[PDB]
């Protein structure tokens, strides 16, 4: 009925005596600069717009009603809100707003601003928002009390509204949410944009009189006076800039960099620290999306064949120092991954749709193709050939052509110019040995963003962000009605997916019913070969210039850079 803390599943870790998180130093000193890289470019400051390339960190301009801890999958703690009263089914909540809550101009954050914000997303926001919150109302029932009512139960959908940025009506009444912003909006978080150069840098300054600096969720965080993002057109130029000291911190995503290029005077003299930690929670995964709305990838057999042409064991051994693990799940390294045979609860979910399922969903555990790693896997390439031929794509000369029409089998791989892409030519070569032509097109960050959003590609790389439980967000990425959300990478509209996700969205907060539902969905998504699995590693590889100190404990779901601070003694030992 009344609480200070919420959890999507289970109970919140910091439900009692909450003074600060475990993964901060509450005494961390304020001051100093951290300089970071970003790849590509940006052209505006509105993260929530229908178009444009928003600046680094422009999704954290605003405080929210509650904020999530970084050492838990989905637990919410007071930020702008102090507390909430609620129905046992979470279908309604009355949120008490902290009377100290202020925007950067020193004006109050009120229940009206929250009501205004919800209506703003509903009428000018991304089209998925009004679809998800279609039966929902958000009303200021008192100056500092906002009442949220859902039309149907959705504990996660309710808690997700706690993460909505709270906009100041006084500013946003004059700007459409759907339009990009050439200058930063009036905001409220612990850092404000203070200068920038369009497409090149953004500087954030710590708000020194931030109203919430001493809330428990904020203690020991937001330590740096300045956070600077410099933009680099590709990762090789950024990595060389890092080694020369042009920015302070690097997340290393290239296996060859890590294995062979962390060398030179700066490492010998220990000006740069390098660190590698096993990461035991849910994992981001890389994939290549097949646009299944294009005729070239409409047939599951052709998608299966092209997958067989991707020689991961060769790439890992010859190119990547054995660093990577093969992606094999949409719930990678969680309990929701379909890594065993369906149990009885899964078959109750699955058997009704047997006619619309690959039969392997019932008989086999999904395993991406394995080669011996020698190059030229003959079993896998012969199977690819067999499947292509069945789908009507047959060799005429050295080229695969449609058996009916004589059209060559050809597609374009769309790539960001900014990425390393060492796997691309070997994949192209493998495809060429099957008679498949893959054109490579590298484009800038603004073209890539636009085309990724509109699905104007045959194939492109996509990251599937870690999903620690089967979230109601899955509908946005996979359900037919959300096809134009920008998150449905293959273009799939399936009644099987829809039905399993409708079940999931009706079981929000219920781990017992979500376990077999997540596994079931995982079998459907994987066995349809909607995307070509690439790789991940359960290990964070970080390097930084030795000017920082860190809390003893690192959070489970993030690197915790926002808990670091500038260490004047370590920094004094580095050259200019």
């Amino acid at each position: 009925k009344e609480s200070y803390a919420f959890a999507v599943l289970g109970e919140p870790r910091y439900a009692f005596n909450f003074n600060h998180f475990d993964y901060v130093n509450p005494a961390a000193p304020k001051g100093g600069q951290i300089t970071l890289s970003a790849l590509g470019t940006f052209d505006n400051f509105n993260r929530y717009a229908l178009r444009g390339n928003p600046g680094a960190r422009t999704e954290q301009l605003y405080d929210t009603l509650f904020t999530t801890s970084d050492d838990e999958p989905g637990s919410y703690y007071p930020l702008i809100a102090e507390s909430a009263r609620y129905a046992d089914d979470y279908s309604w909540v009355e949120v008490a707003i902290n009377p100290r809550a202020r925007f950067h101009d020193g004006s109050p954050i009120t229940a009206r601003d929250v009501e205004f914000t919800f209506q703003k997303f509903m009428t000018e926001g991304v089209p998925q928002f009004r679809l998800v919150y279609k039966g929902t109302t958000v009303k200021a029932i008192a100056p500092l009390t906002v009442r949220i009512e859902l039309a149907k139960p959705g504990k996660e959908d309710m808690l997700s509204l706690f993460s909505l940025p709270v906009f100041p009506e006084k500013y946003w009444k004059d700007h459409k949410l759907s339009d990009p912003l050439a200058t930063p909006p009036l905001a409220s978080g612990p850092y404000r944009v203070t200068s920038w150069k369009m497409g090149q840098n953004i500087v954030y300054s710590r708000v020194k009189d931030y109203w919430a600096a001493n809330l428990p969720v904020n203690r020991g965080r937001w330590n740096f006076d300045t956070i600077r993002y410099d933009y680099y057109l590709d990762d090789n130029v950024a990595f060389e800039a890092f080694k020369a000291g042009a920015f302070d911190l690097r997340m290393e995503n290239d296996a060859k960099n890590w294995a062979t290029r962390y060398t030179g005077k700066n490492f010998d003299k220990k000006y740069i620290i390098k660190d590698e930690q096993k990461n035991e929670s849910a994992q981001d995964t890389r994939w290549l999306a097949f646009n299944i709305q294009r005729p070239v990838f409409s047939d599951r057999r052709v998608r299966e064949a092209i997958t067989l042409a991707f020689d991961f064991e060769w790439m890992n051994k010859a190119l990547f120092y054995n660093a990577w693990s093969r992606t094999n799940s949409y719930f990678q390294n969680t309990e929701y991954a379909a890594r065993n045979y369906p149990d009885a609860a899964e078959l109750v979910l699955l058997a009704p749709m047997k006619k619309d399922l690959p039969s392997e969903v019932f008989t086999q555990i999904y395993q991406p193709p394995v080669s011996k790693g020698d190059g030229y896997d003959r079993d896998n390439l012969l199977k690819a050939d067999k499947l292509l031929n069945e789908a009507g794509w047959v060799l005429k000369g050295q080229q695969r052509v449609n058996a009916t029409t004589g059209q060559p089998l050809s597609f374009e791989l769309l790539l960001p110019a900014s990425s390393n892409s060492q796997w691309v030519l070997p994949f192209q070569h493998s495809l060429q040995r099957l008679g498949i032509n893959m054109d490579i097109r590298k484009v800038d960050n603004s073209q890539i963003t636009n085309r990724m959003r509109s699905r104007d590609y045959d194939m492109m790389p996509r990251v599937w962000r870690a999903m620690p439980w089967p979230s109601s967000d899955l509908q946005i990425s996979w359900s037919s009605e959300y096809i134009n959300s920008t998150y449905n990478a293959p273009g799939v509209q399936s009644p099987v997916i829809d039905s399993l996700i409708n079940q999931i969205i009706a079981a929000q907060g219920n781990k017992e019913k979500l376990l077999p539902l997540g596994r079931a969905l995982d079998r459907v998504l994987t066995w349809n070969y909607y995307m070509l699995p690439m790789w991940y590693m359960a290990e964070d590889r970080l390097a930084w210039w030795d000017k920082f100190s860190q809390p003893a404990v690192r959070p489970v779901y993030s690197l915790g850079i926002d808990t670091w601070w500038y260490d004047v003694n370590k920094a004094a030992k580095l050259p200019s």
Partner: peptide
């Protein structure tokens, strides 16, 4: 993501 478009 319910509030913004991909990246």
């Amino acid at each position: 993501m319910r509030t913004g478009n991909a990246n």
